[PDB]
Design an enzyme around this catalytic site. Sequence first.
Site: not given
Ligand SMILES: NC(=O)CC[C@H](N)C(=O)O
Ligand SMILES: [Mg+2]
Ligand SMILES: [Mg+2]
Lengths: 443, 443
Positions: B52, B131, B133, B188, B195, B244, B315, B332, B334
């Site tokens: 289905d 990546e 997490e 992490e 991760e 990311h 940041r 990348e 994010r």
């Molecule tokens: N780049 C990282 O390792 C940070 C991860 C972080 N938890 C995020 O939301 O991007």
């Molecule tokens: Mg990253």
């Molecule tokens: Mg990360």
Amino acid sequence: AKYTREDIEKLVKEENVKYIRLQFTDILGTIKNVEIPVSQLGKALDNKVMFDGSSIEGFVRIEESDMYLYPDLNTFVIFPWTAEKGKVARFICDIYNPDGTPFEGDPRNNLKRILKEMEDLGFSDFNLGPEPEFFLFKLDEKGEPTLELNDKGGYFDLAPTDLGENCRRDIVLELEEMGFEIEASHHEVAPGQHEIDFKYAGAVRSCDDIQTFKLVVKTIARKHGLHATFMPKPLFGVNGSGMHCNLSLFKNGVNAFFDENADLQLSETAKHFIAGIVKHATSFTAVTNPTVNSYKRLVPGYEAPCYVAWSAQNRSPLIRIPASRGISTRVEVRSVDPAANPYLALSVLLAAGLDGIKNKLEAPAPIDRNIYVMSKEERMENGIVDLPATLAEALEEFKSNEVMVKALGEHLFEHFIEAKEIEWDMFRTQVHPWEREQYMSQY
Amino acid sequence: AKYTREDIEKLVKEENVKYIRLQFTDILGTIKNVEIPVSQLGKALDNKVMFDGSSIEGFVRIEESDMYLYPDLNTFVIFPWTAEKGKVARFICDIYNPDGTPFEGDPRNNLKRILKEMEDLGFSDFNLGPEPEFFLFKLDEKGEPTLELNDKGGYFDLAPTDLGENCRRDIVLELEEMGFEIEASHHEVAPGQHEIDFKYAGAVRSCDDIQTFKLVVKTIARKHGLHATFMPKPLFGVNGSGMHCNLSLFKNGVNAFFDENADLQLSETAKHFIAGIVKHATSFTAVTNPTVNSYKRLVPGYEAPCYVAWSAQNRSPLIRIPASRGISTRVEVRSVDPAANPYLALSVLLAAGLDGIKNKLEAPAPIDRNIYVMSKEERMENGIVDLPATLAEALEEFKSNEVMVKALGEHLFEHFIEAKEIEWDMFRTQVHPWEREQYMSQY
Ligand SMILES: NC(=O)CC[C@H](N)C(=O)O
Ligand SMILES: [Mg+2]
Ligand SMILES: [Mg+2]
Ligand SMILES: [Mg+2]
Ligand SMILES: [Mg+2]
Ligand SMILES: [Mg+2]
Ligand SMILES: [Mg+2]
């Protein structure tokens, strides 16, 4: 050259190594790592593995910056307890900038920096003999630490016994199987407290061993239903844990602190060292005792030093000289605690020593049966200064000092100061129960 | 290819496979499957298995619909656990219509669509380095998840040890010894957070591997009395999780983002591609960030983005360019979190990328320092737009963007909005306890 590329590749294969730990160290002494599958040993070597080197600044991170890991071949270790799908090995690594140069903000590359200073002054080696002490607390049902102690042993007692929970035993045994070299161990003063002493080694190797050792400990302890902590002062009323550091300088593979024809068989070189250490202790304290609680251990009543002095026979000498002489002549700094980061500690210490030798500094008279009974006033009327009383205190003094700020380098210094200043602020703004017991009924 | 008919038939018999999983994905990224006995393997392989396919719609499902399961020999794997009354194997599948043509509402077929779109633009492959997490919580006595984390580790610190549970390890070990090609793993920022990062591959293979990953994880952790989750922000006041995505375009087997004699060594293509992600973010957020809870992670202070911008070092930039060049030259994004359906995300991203390449869009100024402080107003005057604050908002933007709608497909689109609006509608009418606490005595 303990191992070479092939010797390791051969070895990874001969055994069943399947997981690689590329381990380093952040600025707070925390032991970090990035792990790869053995299938990446090659990329691993070739120094081609990248990571967020800002993991090193610790909780004061702000942005993500790429950095290289460079594995130190001759630090190759295979962890024993492993073997599930495969075994586990590791590499201590030096962090390199993405452009090729070593990252200056790396604790380990800093020790090396200052070791180049030592060699340019004409010395070959700077040895260390750590006496790391730690507590064993019991785990509870939900696998949580409790305030209950693993045993009721006293000083050099015959601790737990050869019928199981002898953690010290398995630890020392496991370490010896991993290639360490232990001198001896023993139960320490308070109940549930322990000490294992490493043979002497060159600054780096000694610092690397101190990291592993802590790791090895923490693990075996959990395996036995226990909690190991290297917290300096876990319990009010009981002893704290410190990590005395036996120190020696070498010249042409010959010990340089020894002079059989001088006063106390101590060379002029030896005495300048002690001199520099006395000059800088109230300033390198914020580094050898990096936590808030580090200062709760630094109080009258236990074997911990609260003032700057040296002696061969005293209650709580910040500097002591063990009996052994000749090839074993060495200065022991008894203020360092296990909460301290070894690379940084040995950075600031090595540096304060060299500052005595460079400038032919004059050491003061050895103290002996005085400090502790004479009021801080009488003590003060002499070279006898009190170490800082709190982390905030230790931080002011630290910053004031120019030869200690240099011992770290702008990056290692900026952040250390930042992190510690927060740590203190959090503690200061905090309202503890003790205060409520005191003031909430009385006012 | 990798596996051929008879190669598989040999593998099944020798390895003693007895239970095949015909595996696929629904709109909500949720991983579905029809499972047959080894004996049915033939029917399967001849593309004759029916089910289905309205299961693809998820809960928006209204009427049943007979569709075919088309296995993909190259996605054949034998699960390492199993081995009871025999071993288990799977086949990732493409859903066809009873008339032999691929069913559009299928996300895997949808990406293959936008990929072909890429080839018309004359490109060879679309690469992903994800990546993913996750959080590991504990299971209670009833075997029910709690809010208790599996450890207290932080960023990159070596934790937990090699004695016991060590999920992360055992996961990478299983993956690696199961055909996977992992690059590295690590702890992490938040306690209990982990991760694993895999080597880049082409969109389809990369998305299939993400769905298999999650599963293998979910599985391994359950086996250790733990609960894994890819929920973006399980807990208020701690870091959320994200995925990311590292993106790169090839032309004739050669990275097309790279360019030595260029600025940042980024090709004109690179600059354009980026340009596209910049102007479609706000309108593709609803897809990369599909859950209501997804937007609770999109708050300032936790490494997760909140504005449309790209940097090489900042940041929390929506887009960032890691250090490496040459083959590793990559973009990348994010924004993306784990909850997202990898196929949908990759297709909505490829589509926005190509769009900016197609129409030669001008990439904006790369952001220097500060998007945090620079208040709304100022941030605006700099062409820095905010992401949608809520799933609702995110939807209104997605629905407005012509090209994004086309990236999904009339069917996928229609049903995706259908789901999300009801999802939002529920959450909006719900009276959370927070309201009661703030208002019940206040008013
Ligand atoms: N780049 C990282 O390792 C940070 C991860 C972080 N938890 C995020 O939301 O991007
Ligand atoms: Mg990253
Ligand atoms: Mg990360
Ligand atoms: Mg900084
Ligand atoms: Mg001792
Ligand atoms: Mg001692
Ligand atoms: Mg319908």
